[PDB]
Each structure stands twice: as structure tokens, then as C-alpha cells.
Amino acid sequence: GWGSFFRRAAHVGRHVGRAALTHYL
């Protein structure tokens, strides 16, 4: 709508959001 103010309260779900390629897992 005006900016989809929702997930911004946690940026999707962090972790995978920011990065994860570092984890050899």
C-alpha cells in the first residue's frame, strides 16, 4: 500500500535475509 509496513518490523526474518553464505552448512 503506502509502503507495505509490516515485515519491516524485523526485515522478513533476518538471518537468511542479511547473509548466510558464510556458514559452511
From Swiss-Prot:
It is found in: Secreted. Goblet cells. It comes from the Eukaryota. Belongs to the pleurocidin family. Antimicrobial peptide with potent activity against Gram-positive and Gram-negative bacteria. Activity against E.coli and B.subtilis. Weaker activity against L.mucor, s.marcescens and P.aeruginosa. May play a role in innate host defense. This is Pleurocidin. It comes from Pseudopleuronectes americanus (Winter flounder). The chain holds residues 23 to 47 of 68 of the full protein.
